[PDB]
């Protein structure tokens, strides 16, 4: 992604074990709930994990998310985007 | 003589606890034209 | 305008230390008096 980043006031990292790395069809396994708010200076994050009976919609019942980190932007902030992963495979070329 | 310690002049609204913000476009009092340059009625963004 | 925030956190903090010191021209404090601070466990301490 970057050169070199010169300068980030704010950078950091959580523990390290894995998840799903490969291409493999499937079923929805789970669902990750996540809420992202900012509020007088701070950026607040909250989570809640689940698996899943049901592919197309948001779930019936109801569960709160517990709030995993607090962290103290002073940012503007007007817009979002979200991100997602590819996979590279011998089956794909591996190319952009 | 040390200049370097920067204030806001101007925001378009006022500034929220604990927020901050560099942006530091040159700000126009009424003509149009100048885009990112400091020209007659166009004055550097950020006081010190 | 670039103000400086920093996190503290995991320690233990000695507030007399401050307190006491002469090297402060103002201490105002909003919630609580100074005497108080070594008293207190922080949840989270940011030095702006």
Same mark, same amino acid.
């Given at each position: 992604?970057?050169?070199?980043? *010169?300068?980030?006031?704010?950078?950091?990292?959580?523990?390290?074990? &894995?998840?799903?790395?490969?291409? /493999? #069809?499937?079923? !929805?396994? *789970? %669902?990750?709930?996540?809420?992202?708010?900012?509020?007088? @200076?701070? !950026? $607040?994050?909250?989570? $809640?994990?689940?698996?899943? *009976? &049901?592919?197309?919609?948001?779930?019936?019942?109801?569960?709160?998310?517990?709030?995993?980190?607090?962290?103290?932007? @002073?940012?503007?902030?007007?817009? !979002?985007?979200? &991100?997602?992963?590819?996979?590279?495979?011998?089956?794909?070329?591996?190319?952009? | 003589? *040390?200049?370097?310690?920067?204030?806001? %002049? !101007?925001?378009?609204?006022?500034?929220?606890?604990?927020?901050?913000?560099?942006?530091?476009?040159?700000? #126009?009092?009424?003509?149009?034209?100048?885009?990112?340059?400091?020209?007659?009625?166009?004055?550097?963004?950020? #006081?010190? | 305008?670039?103000?400086?925030? $920093?996190?503290?956190?995991?320690?233990?903090?000695?507030?007399?230390?401050?307190?006491?010191?002469?090297?402060?021209?103002?201490?105002?404090?909003?919630?609580?008096?100074?005497? /108080? &601070?070594?008293?207190?466990?922080?949840?989270?301490?940011?030095?702006?």
């Amino acid at each position: 992604v970057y050169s070199s980043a *010169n300068n980030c006031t704010f950078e950091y990292v959580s523990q390290p074990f &894995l998840m799903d790395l490969e291409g /493999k #069809q499937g079923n !929805f396994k *789970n %669902l990750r709930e996540f809420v992202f708010k900012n509020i007088d @200076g701070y !950026f $607040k994050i909250y989570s $809640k994990h689940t698996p899943i *009976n &049901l592919v197309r919609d948001l779930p019936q019942g109801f569960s709160a998310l517990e709030p995993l980190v607090d962290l103290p932007i @002073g940012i503007n902030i007007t817009r !979002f985007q979200t &991100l997602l992963a590819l996979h590279r495979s011998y089956l794909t070329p591996g190319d952009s | 003589g *040390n200049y370097n310690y920067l204030y806001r %002049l !101007f925001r378009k609204s006022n500034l929220k606890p604990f927020e901050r913000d560099i942006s530091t476009e040159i700000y #126009q009092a009424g003509s149009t034209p100048c885009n990112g340059v400091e020209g007659f009625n166009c004055y550097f963004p950020l #006081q010190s | 305008y670039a103000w400086n925030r $920093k996190r503290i956190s995991n320690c233990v903090a000695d507030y007399s230390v401050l307190y006491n010191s002469a090297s402060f021209s103002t201490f105002k404090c909003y919630g609580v008096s100074p005497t /108080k &601070l070594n008293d207190l466990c922080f949840t989270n301490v940011y030095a702006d």
